[PDB]
Write a protein that binds this ligand. Structure first.
Ligand SMILES: *[C@@H]1O[C@H](CO)[C@@H](O[C@@H]2O[C@H](CO)[C@@H](O)[C@H](O)[C@H]2NC(C)=O)[C@H](O)[C@H]1NC(C)=O
Lengths: 18, 228
């Protein structure tokens, strides 16, 4: 999938789903 | 959080709000002078002087009578945090004491949460669905089940991304989860702190439970860096 870090400035958590 | 209801004003005394510059995060009061949050919140290393912690809050960024505001004297990110894997995603905030040497002034609205002894409630002020425009105003809580590592790790779920130190919670069917704006938020089980809201992939989607820092995994680190 795509995964992000629950922060409203949110970053990609990187090697998830790709 | 997604799929939840407004939390009672006194239901989550331990939860803490953290504000600085243009940023926000949550955390849990685990001792009168100590808040436990997510490392990724303080990744960019803001200066302690700029941090404001608010205890006893119900409405995000709303002043209130039981509310208590505190400066942050210092903080420690876990030495092994990775901004790539998000492994080891936790941090300690040492609150600034007043002239009496007290930090938090405990009351029915301000109290530490127990660290785990070694079904759950998740709480926060973040997005009530993914892509939401604003933060909840009233604190939300929702009930979520723990998920065994062998089932969270499975390739239809989260796969290779689940590393030592993480833990998962939520319905494989989907629906109840934390979201953006809930980082550093508390996952409370049977009442003790067992997770820190860290990351996931889309709020509450089917087959995508939320991923938390597993607080019991880090008890020794927490004890060691929580003296003083
Ligand atoms: C609401 O959020 C603002 C942030 O815009 C908070 O502000 C801080 O207030 C202290 C003094 O109490 C200052 O020293 C900080 O530098 C301020 N930070 C920022 C980023 O402005 C305010 O405390 C919050 N009010 C609440 C939660 O009731």
């Amino acid at each position: 999938x795509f995964a992000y870090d629950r922060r409203x400035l949110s970053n990609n958590x990187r090697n998830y789903x790709g | 959080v997604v799929g939840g209801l407004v939390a009672l004003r006194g239901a989550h005394p331990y939860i803490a709000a953290l504000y600085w510059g243009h940023s926000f995060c949550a955390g849990s009061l685990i001792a009168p002078c100590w808040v436990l949050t997510a490392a990724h919140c303080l990744q960019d290393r803001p200066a302690p002087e700029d941090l404001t912690v608010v205890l006893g809050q119900e409405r995000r960024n709303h002043s209130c009578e039981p509310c208590q505001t505190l400066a942050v004297r210092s903080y420690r990110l876990h030495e092994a945090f990775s901004p790539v894997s998000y492994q080891h995603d936790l941090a300690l905030l040492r609150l600034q004491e007043d002239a009496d040497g007290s930090c938090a002034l405990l009351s029915p609205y301000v109290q530490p949460v127990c660290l785990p002894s070694g079904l759950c409630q998740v709480a926060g002020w973040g997005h009530q669905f993914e892509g939401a425009e604003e933060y909840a105003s009233f604190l939300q809580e929702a009930q979520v089940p723990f998920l065994s590592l062998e089932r969270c790790s499975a390739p239809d779920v989260h796969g290779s991304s689940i590393l030592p130190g993480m833990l998962c919670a939520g319905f494989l069917e989907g629906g109840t989860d934390a979201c953006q704006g809930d980082s550093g938020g508390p996952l409370v089980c049977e009442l003790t702190l067992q997770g820190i809201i860290s990351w996931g992939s889309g709020c509450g989607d089917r087959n995508k439970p939320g991923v938390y820092t597993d607080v019991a995994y880090y008890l020794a680190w927490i004890r060691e860096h929580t003296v003083s």
